[PDB]
Nucleic acid binder design. Sequence first.
RNA 1: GUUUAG
Length: 94
Amino acid sequence: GHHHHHHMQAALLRRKSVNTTECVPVPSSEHVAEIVGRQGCKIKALRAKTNTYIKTPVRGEEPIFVVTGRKEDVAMAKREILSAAEHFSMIRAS
RNA sequence: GUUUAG
């Protein structure tokens, strides 16, 4: 709800425990789809696991996630997104 | 043996 959004922005403004925001590109919206999962189940699990705010890109726009949180947490979420994107490329590529 | 949540 709005409480979560407001508190998230307040945490960014303190720049204590949340201190990093990074763009994480993947090759295509099809990659985005498989990384996010149905109903966003996989990207929501990733946010929970890494304690990160993640913005999923809209289909048809640039397939680039934005990941925000503690530096080491953003690095873990970025690692998992990029590894997932490479996974789907390796197993789907013709 | 995966295919877009707020």
